[PDB]
Design a protein around this ligand. Sequence first.
Ligand SMILES: [Cl-]
Length: 384
Amino acid sequence: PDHELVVCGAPDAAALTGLLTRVRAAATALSRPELTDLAAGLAAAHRGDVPARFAAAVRDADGLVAALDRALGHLAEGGRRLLDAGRGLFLVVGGPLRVGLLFPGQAAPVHADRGALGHLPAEPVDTAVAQPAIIADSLAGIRWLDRLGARPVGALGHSLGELAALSWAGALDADDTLALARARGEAMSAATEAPSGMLSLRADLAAARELAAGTGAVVAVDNGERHVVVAGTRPELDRVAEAARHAGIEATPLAVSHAFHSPLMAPAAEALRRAAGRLPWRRPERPVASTVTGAWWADEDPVEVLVRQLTGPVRFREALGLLDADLLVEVGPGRMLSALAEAAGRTAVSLDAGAASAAGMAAGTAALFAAGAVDDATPFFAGR
Ligand SMILES: [Cl-]
């Protein structure tokens, strides 16, 4: 792999300081192969009840020494919790922490991302292909969490990702979830009755509703105080873009040929209802914060919820606020939701399941171990 995962731990902070000092001395000038041997040994030796924990994803021995210097500096100042998702460095004394899962949906590319630089097109996703492709990578990430025995507090899924979150929660098996994703992507790829799309606003929900009022456009995706997407026909979107320029709000056209999460998706929701009502749904057994209802899942009919999902807004801000978690781990390809969660002020890292780079699998697994949601990092060293 291109990133190595280095874990260890000790009974308390003073003991962890001693151990990290020793690992730092031993790491200076190790070759890559030597680093892998050290890391594989440390994962074998530091598993089970490991009270105080360090984990880092590193490119090389110098990266490891850098990460240890940061962790040592932290402990020296009496710190007991250092969570740096963007550097894949995690240190926790007195855990476990609460870890929540994020299940992504389809990417939301900008139509013509400048470039000149703006201060001075992209093709839409093929949704019938993309939806089952993303769900397959998320189901691979759930298998990784199952191999590790992960113990998160709850999950949420963005749009499509709610299907994976329900599968993780036991409402539907993997094969049925993948088949439902195929059906959903086929339904949602059908043309809308008239040309339509989506427009991203750097603004909050009330500001978006003010710009959309009277235009025909509607809120499609509520991602947070800094990001709301509206949807509608092209004339409707043009009204909002004009209103946004007058109000001084940045409106960015997205590369999509559908007003997803608007009433123009009603025909697709009818087709989805047929596919969904044929499945042996079960009550979820783990907490799911729905981005359809903005509330915890509780005895809902899944057919009704997943059908009105298509026409109503994605309540990612509300669902993310419900999920009480010191650390979030994204379980899916890419880092779409970790980016969204970071923009809401939360700490998040992506496993980036199915990626060429082991960057995400090393960082994500480091986060799960240091937070105490998994007890054993040896699966990262298996079967290379
Ligand atoms: Cl709302």
